[PDB]
């Protein structure tokens, strides 16, 4: 049906709609240009100082997200959890036979 016409004047018509796309993005595609995930978090504002601004500022308008980002790295930062088998996904290798790992290991 690449041809529709007004059945009286016999002239052509070309029924068409405006463009829309928004095509999807599959998990695998990302692991083809970069084999790492960029985590921009670190601030050199000395580990302990952050612990007070995520509290006293947790009132209104204060407590910047940079504060909670830097503190949350701070606490979880340590390395724990013996790997009891293996870990590998999307051509990336995290753990092996028996590492230790931490949350930060991404």
């Amino acid at each position: 049906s690449v041809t529709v016409k007004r059945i009286i004047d016999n002239t052509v018509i070309v029924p068409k709609l405006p463009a829309n796309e928004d095509p999807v993005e599959y998990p695998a595609d990302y692991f083809r240009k970069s084999k790492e995930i960029p985590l921009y978090i670190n601030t050199t504002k000395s580990l302990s100082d952050l612990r007070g601004y995520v509290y006293q500022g947790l009132k209104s308008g204060n407590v910047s997200i940079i504060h909670v980002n830097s503190y949350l790295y701070g606490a979880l930062k340590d390395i724990r959890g013996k790997l009891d088998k293996d870990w590998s996904s999307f051509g990336i290798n995290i753990g092996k036979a028996g590492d230790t790992i931490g949350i930060f290991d991404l």
Partner: protein
């Protein structure tokens, strides 16, 4: 407010309540409704720019005063019908005129990034052709049909003045009936066995039933056999569709259907 302050944290800004005063009147400028239109048009090209967040407000300029073109796409998606089967399914002189008007070639309404969407704000046009007030029959017919077909937004669409409602309404109803009364429904996947049903339709003579699929011609002939006055079952389908509809606001094609059909 919040969409801009990516953790800057303020409060309340526009003090006194709106009286169209310190608010609405900001886009009478030929050169500023130009800036909205160029920001949007560009940042449409790549929406993945650092500063693509600009379109938090420039969006409305895209197809501003082009609701008719918008309605069309929605009927298609609601009916599930092709980009032209719907066109063939138009059965009103005055709606086919407007429909020629919309689809006139050499206008780039079907190209990805184009000036077209902004013609009102971009100052390309003063009175747009794909408007919902310059195609005021296509609007009513498209909307009533979409509604009769379980539309969520049609309910709240504006009902145009000075159009041929009567002729526009049985037409909408019959369309709605056709696409409603019989569905697609064909087996899509399988493992070993599947349903064959290619040349199979009627052995014959029981009939009286409405046509098989959605051939505009078959339906028009069937309708000619019912003396051209819409039949009980049709009138039921509508009543069925519009009752249970609640809290409709005035001057909508929604309040219209409900009054026309629920009795």
């Amino acid at each position: 407010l919040t969409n801009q302050c990516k953790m800057i944290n303020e409060q309340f800004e526009p003090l006194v309540p709106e009286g169209r005063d310190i608010f609405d009147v900001w886009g009478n400028d030929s050169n500023y409704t130009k800036i909205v239109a160029a920001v949007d048009m560009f940042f449409h090209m790549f929406k993945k720019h650092e500063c693509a967040s600009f379109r938090y407000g420039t969006i409305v300029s895209r197809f501003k005063d082009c609701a008719a073109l918008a309605t069309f796409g929605h009927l298609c998606k609601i009916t599930g019908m092709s980009t032209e089967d719907v066109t063939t399914w138009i059965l009103n002189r005055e709606v086919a005129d407007e429909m020629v008007q919309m689809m006139l070639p050499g206008q780039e309404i079907d190209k990805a990034d184009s000036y077209m969407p902004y013609l009102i704000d971009f100052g390309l046009s003063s009175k747009s052709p794909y408007s919902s007030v310059k195609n005021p029959a296509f609007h009513f017919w498209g909307q009533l049909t979409a509604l009769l077909l379980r539309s969520t937004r049609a309910r709240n669409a504006r009902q145009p003045d000075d159009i041929e409602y009567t002729s526009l309404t049985t037409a909408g109803l019959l369309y709605a009936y056709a696409v409603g009364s019989s569905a697609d429904l064909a087996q899509q996947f399988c493992v070993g066995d599947n349903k064959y049903t290619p040349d199979d339709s009627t052995g014959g003579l029981t009939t009286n039933a409405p046509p098989q699929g959605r051939d505009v011609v078959e339906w028009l002939g069937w309708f000619e056999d019912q003396n051209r006055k819409p039949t009980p079952d049709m009138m039921q389908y509508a009543k069925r569709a519009v009752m249970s509809l609640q809290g409709l606001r005035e001057k909508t094609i929604g309040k219209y259907a409900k009054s026309e059909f629920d009795k």
